[model samples]
Target: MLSHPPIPIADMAEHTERLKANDSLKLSQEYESIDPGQQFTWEHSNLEVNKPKNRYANVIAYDHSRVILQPIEGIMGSDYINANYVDGYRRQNAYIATQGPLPETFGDFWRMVWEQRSATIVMMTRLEEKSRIKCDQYWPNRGTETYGFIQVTLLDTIELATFCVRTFSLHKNGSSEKREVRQFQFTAWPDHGVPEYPTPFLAFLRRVKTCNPPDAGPIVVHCSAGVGRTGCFIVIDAMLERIKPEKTVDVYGHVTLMRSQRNYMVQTEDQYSFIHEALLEAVGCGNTEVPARSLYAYIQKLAQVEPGEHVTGMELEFKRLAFISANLPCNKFKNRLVNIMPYESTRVCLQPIRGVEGSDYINASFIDGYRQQKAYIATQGPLAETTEDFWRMLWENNSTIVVMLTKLREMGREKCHQYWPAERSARYQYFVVDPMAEYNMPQYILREFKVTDARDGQSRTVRQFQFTDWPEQGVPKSGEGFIDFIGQVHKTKEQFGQDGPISVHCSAGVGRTGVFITLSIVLERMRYEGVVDIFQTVKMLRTQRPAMVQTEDEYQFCYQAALEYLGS
Candidate 1:
């Protein structure tokens, strides 16, 4: 795949060090910077009439360069597929990075392929991973089928150890204008991480490259959300073909450059690190040890090769663990009360409504931020039976804004209850959720509510901010979208509300809620202090709430989101 001698892993430090002397790794941040830059954010999904197309794609957008396939007037384009035009080395619009077609967007996805005239489609993930449907079975098993504007027939398939290659005959819906297309389905990708080894990945890369023409229609590449694995494959292909001998590779700069075309290009620090590891292994100096998230921390530090810590290395595990291990006296029960509540005696918990007392009392806690007091009240999403209690907690805390981070269900599993009103009003004993005004932004659902104490008929207006941007299991698809939603939440609270905690929830609550609180505090600090200390902000939060931020991914995202918020 390369002309130069294979590079050694040991030599990578010095070599990579020279690649981007002035540049730093902002892989995720750069990906998010352009998320909102796309033509649409699936901003219409809020309506019940529109069919759902994507869970992750709606939040991430393609940059302005590629052709956005919009449904013709009354066609099935109400749900737009997530795809982007990615420029190649010395080429413009060389690749289209996109989310795998959902069952509903199969029509839009195929139209994207046909209209864009892309003959090669690279799928870097399986249809399902771990008993979950990652992508709809978009392609046919065999024979012929039609998806809106295009017709496709599966010709044959070639199965490899790590991936599969299939050929298909494609044509327009109305005419006999036909073309042959190659579909590369990568099946060996580890659930949500990199493959076991890079040999399969690299060999797969070689095949995808052989099929990619320099002058053909934009090559479409996708994974589940079209960023993580897709970004990895694209990086490897570009490095191999474009940067050949002793390639500086410029994974950092290259990804950043491509992200201007599509956001969420490389989803994680681990994925970013894998790009280097894969290439290192390809060059004959591959490591025998399995990839670990810990390596992301060390490798990124070595990759950084700088005194600057605030840049992008914060996503590295070293930084993640360093802060997590820091002792904060308040989170003594960090693991206790588990996912249900804080350390009982500490943190802000919603008191029971006098007579009604128990776990349904609402196990939420108060979480404050720097220079911004009464900033947030982090709580778990309401349980089906706890709906009334959730309302009581909100009313008791005098909360002005309610941020729901998780969907009512994720992948057909119920993570949270439908706590909010469905129509104009729904009574949840003692409390009535009267819907006032509902506004659907790109990142979240902004709904005003009249929370009336039905027992006393005392009514007051409260804002409900449901941030549907985050993915089911990890950080949000785009830090830009994530922070932008938060920015609006802050603005709305500042403009039209009295003093009360902004209660944030996401299933168990702490995971994403902590991220929001942390980002809010860090951004607040950055605005006033002229600098931000993520570690300090997190340490302070942990002191206040047991497990404010959940995992390393959430930790890294907090910093990334804050950076994006400040950049705005």
Candidate 2:
């Protein structure tokens, strides 16, 4: 059939060089300035409860790219999976090119498949390409396979020479939420490079495109680290479908656009050039609908003055800092109360906690991570009388890590009351707290405390890290101290165990506490993913908890903290 002619790969060498010459990928070129490698090292060192399945340590997902507060939630505490939802050629909910599901993330994988309502999955590599285990076996061969919220039943399997096509019916555990899902597991392609001749892949690509009906969510794709093979498939589609008669093939432009949302796609130059080779075949076909003038014409225009310029690092730093004023909505003690909640829906439900029947409410709200749904409980410092309410919150959420940014006193004035016991043990109302251990450092103090209920001896342990470096209304003297303090907080949590969302507070809670949580979240992102958007991170923080990073001083410090950490 003329509709399915084989893709010729004879004249692929020259096209590879041609594509490289006309490369317009600014993000890849700016790798030195951004220093993703350095960031990766730091990320690798961060608190990791669950080990990631990435073969390459550096290619981590940015906090922004992660499935923010997963649609089908889990109690795993870490919303970080080695997965990122990347937009395709020109589509919004286009494709999720995530790493192959690790054994640990099998439940999360199926839950996403069910939650995202993805119609199809395009797996581009075998479970074991030779001696290497590229991906863990998540699905079953015949009867049934069940992961946390989803149950899968294999209906049919079609074995092709180059690929395996399988149909699966998915069901949620507690409801009648059932849907049919299809998987195309390609085995012909080798790891880290192109397939032999590109015909089989192109054929599979056509199948993938047609199979994903308009009503479905983005098709889920994975192969090992999910960058090289994933990138090849996406870039081919970008060149073939996005190539309009008026505009030419901007190969690396798509790379930039993809990497902007999802970091480190199209990892190596070898796989990079393979992309051009595949596109050349698609365009050079005799039975083609695309305009003849595509890449050849596109390359000539690329070397000249760039039509789309990239944002410089210094310019971005300035923009991130300049977005806020150093003085706005001052966090004075007079303005501190539980009445001024940002949104009624998110206001901390301060009904006298279940165990203790007392009239108290806390000025706190839930704030999500850039890529996580329930990350932290941002709260104001305790008033002399509201200390019981603060303790009640910790008891309610079952929080393990408590972050106190400001001291009980600031500028010789009572900004916050000492919520914990000053001596050995102090009773609030229904709960009694005893200081178990203390660890002191330059900019922060880590204290371990044991709490017991008066009625029933039920107890819990809390590891509190109090940051002492930041000044009252000004930024930290040096960004490094607080940045280091953030690292310690994460490490302490790792040692303590991430059972619940960390409780954080400063004088007003949103200002310094916001900066602390903001930097902590972004720094982890920078470590694993190698890049972060201070503006986007802060914006998300504010959306969850109003007046986060309260003043411009805090906002500017957030940028400086990010930059300084990157340099470190």
Candidate 3:
């Protein structure tokens, strides 16, 4: 009998932290060490026949793995396209990394895909970005487009918040055989740098992987030069696949390997740093996406009490927060409630006021939204004393979207004071609030305000969305109104396009506020990953602030809200 030795699982968190501590020094050195022309020959990309197909003069694909199409008899450069067959973890030639299709290379691109028999296309760059043409539109916008002998027919397109999926039917001009090809185009990557967050991009990655047939051919991936974003996508995919069995990551090694096959893969130092960050996140937080279709069934299971226990899953999850202390010396009287205060670690600190004792404390916490880090500022409704602090927090954080979850007075109790002006404008302390516009929706009141800093004379537009129908003691009657409120908030945020955390508050900021934040994240998960995790979402919230999703009733309502969202 043969015996196998054990391979110890490495601590991925430690590995990721070590790399991050020095501001990715190792990643930089590793990136600087590789030179495409020096380390590998790009003779094929420079050949006279293929020179016209290259997008960037410097981004040359290597000869060894460069894709070679079935050459046309009369066409001089028939076999060339600026693309390469890059391998995944153990999957050889798992992806075709290519430059964005040049106008002259559109037919060659299709021919490469057709010959490669790739079922999925992942486009990372836009056709046009920042007034520059990065990639030409190769596929037909509405109908069939003929490129040489290949015909591509647009079947359908599904547009999501972070990405767009297009299905196309491909056929030879004279043949009856047709193959369906899917393109997952990520629309959120900024024009200049890497994505602001890795979660949404990771979610998009998950979606692309799910759509890919297990037996399908290699996925064709591209960006402008193809090596930068393309290399990132391949490295992340390979590392993720490797992490499952190996329980370790070789980002440096994998990237070095990619550059060997395709020169200058994992392009910039920032991009290289981004790959580590993405992998670290994936390692720390395994996919929490819960499919929307199965969410109701999971909720049903969560609602049931355990055999020997009295509490359901929601109660047990809430109970887990009791051990986390909110015992900071500064988080006193400023809070609206005696017991509700943000954790010291996650608390949002205000700029210290001279001679004022504990001027930096506010009953607010930075919350992680799905994969978006610090996507929101979860805070309590302002006290009379903290009104100035509220406006200060808003101004300092540059949060344009303010989601107020409670009324000025709910059930005859002062849930929150009138923080903004009722008429034209008003001043709190160092800022001025000017009412801009107001929209009265079916279940909520939306108000716009132009807040100006008194010190600098600088002003910014702020939107306040107040949900008027929520009961004080329980969750919203249904998720429809609340989700609708979330949608409107997102629409405004998108229009403004500012990089600021959304400021959200209720009476104590832990009940309905948590629900709103949780739902916002879950809805994003549903959209990008088609999954929801109410338990994990609330748990993450409670850790940041005390008693988020405050009671079990409120907790149960989170599931209800998620279900209603999925149903809709």
Candidate 4:
């Protein structure tokens, strides 16, 4: 008897001939008797397409697609079918499988099922393995002339009804010097009956993340009846690309556009939401302000945001330098110091000779004592000798101006007359009347002389001034008032052409004199630097000259008062 009725060699040969003539015809055979109710099994195993005997099938050809449908052979009641297809798109391949339960140990079995189905529909129409393999091998050189290849393989082991699907692409550069390979694996659980729909969809996303376009190589995916799973995967992948920084469009917009193109794309609203959430989680929102401390602790509190947490050491250093430059007098004062030229014409030597006490004069000895000795004896003897000597020295020295805060005890009403005589020719003169005088100074003397009456003096012509009026316990209030006092003094000096040098004194030259002069210098610098805050400016001044605002009242005064007497 002939073995199995000679095995119908003609039918096999005829089918092969048809495949060689028109690759599409290879998938035309219908298995009308293949009952879907009869449970099918599936499994997977690796096949080397590079083998010489398999070379023909590996050589992909363009202008025609290949399809293969094979009944997986196994013991009785264990039937399975595997369908593979390949187009002339250089190394691209797809597989389709109809099978039963998968091996429990297959780690990625579900993933395999999803990918195989995706690849079958998107990349291939209907093609058998051998023909599809041939197309993959030849299409690279013949149809596309591309050095890249994509292959998706599915294997089903019927005994276990398990399926393993893999998609891989290999690309070679023009010179063949660079080659890249990317691959993803999925396993399916046929026993679970393809999962609850969403299971495989999610699995597809997980696999896509792994099979991203290699530095080179086109992407490929596959599954049974590839259209459903394949379309989903492609749509999700495209949407991800849009959201990824490497692409231009946003995730939601991308998904919307894709859904419009393919109605079933990104089918679920949840998936759409997931795409947007994923993108926002990845790239973050557009807020870019770096968190910074508030200018004032009493101002709005500090807060943080993404992209604002880190500050460089260099930035910290720059802030430190800026703070010092802004708030330290040593750093700010050097630029404002008077540049006294050394030439004789610009410099004036002020000599202090002994003078009479009776005349209204700046006693040279007293001036010398103020500059050198820091103490003096003011007796009730002939002060006119001292005054005469002082005037003679002042006239000889050609001093800029004379400044005196005369006590009212000695000369009384004759003070201004003694110092500022109509017959005498003096460049400039200032006479301040003392409140503790023996006689009231004449009003004409206050009008004629540049007289500033002390608080005790009766002349209303005196410019009112005070130095020490500030609260002791709280933030001192004299700073602005003192600044205003200096401003008026500055105006007066400007008017009198006495801007060269200023002389300030009290009964003692050290207390209010020092405080007032220092504050004047500081306020002038503040005005030049365009700074308005008095306390901050004072703190800055004190950094250089340790004695700035030296007295307790002076410090308190600087703190409580606004500069120029402006209300706080």
Top lDDT prediction, candidate number: 3
Note the Cα lDDT for every prediction shown: 0.67, 0.67, 0.80, 0.30
Task: Report the C-alpha lDDT of model 1 over 65-146, residue by residue, as the tens digit.
Answer: 4356655788554535566677666667778887778787787788888878888999988888999887788988898899
The candidate 4 region of ten consecutive residues with least summed lDDT is: 368-377
The numbered model that scores best in TM-score is 3
Q: Tens digit of lDDT per residue, candidate 3, span 1-568?
A: 0111221235655655655677777555656865433456677788898888889988887878888889899977677788888989998999999999988999899988888888999999778899999889999989899987889999998775567899999999778789999999987677888975576677678888888987777899998899888888999999889878787677766776677788778878888888877776666554444677788777777778989998886577556544133454564667788788787767787888898757777778988665455789999899888899899998887788899989898778788988888677899989999988888888999998888888999989888999998876666677788778888898888887968899999988988888888888877777766777666666556656767787778777777877887777
Per-prediction TM-score: 0.44, 0.46, 0.71, 0.23
Residue-by-residue lDDT tens digits, candidate 4, 1-568: 1211111222433433442345433322211111123221212111232122121232221111222212225522111112223211122332221111122212122233332333221221112332432112211211223221222222221110112222333222333322222323233212212222232233334434544443322244433333333334454455444344343323333333332222233333333333333332223222111211211221112212226546432232222211222223432221112221112211123442247222222211221111111112111111332333333333343323333333323323322224333343342222243332122232101112333323333232222222333232333333554454556555755565542334333322333443554455444434333333333333322222223333544443432332333233
Q: List the residue pairs that clash in candidate 1.
A: 297-317, 348-365
What lDDT tens digits, residue by residue, belong to model 2 across residues 60-154?
Answer: 76655665336334545445566667776567748888888877778878878877789899898889976888888889879788887689999
RMSD list, candidates in order:
21.0, 21.5, 7.3, 36.9
In model 1, how large is the Cα lDDT of residue 16? 45
Regions of model 4 farther than 4 Å from truth: 1-484, 532-550, 561-568
Where does candidate 1 stray beyond 4 Å? 1-51, 75-79, 213-215, 283-568
The reply for model 2, stretches above 4 Å from the true place, is 1-342, 350-360, 370-372
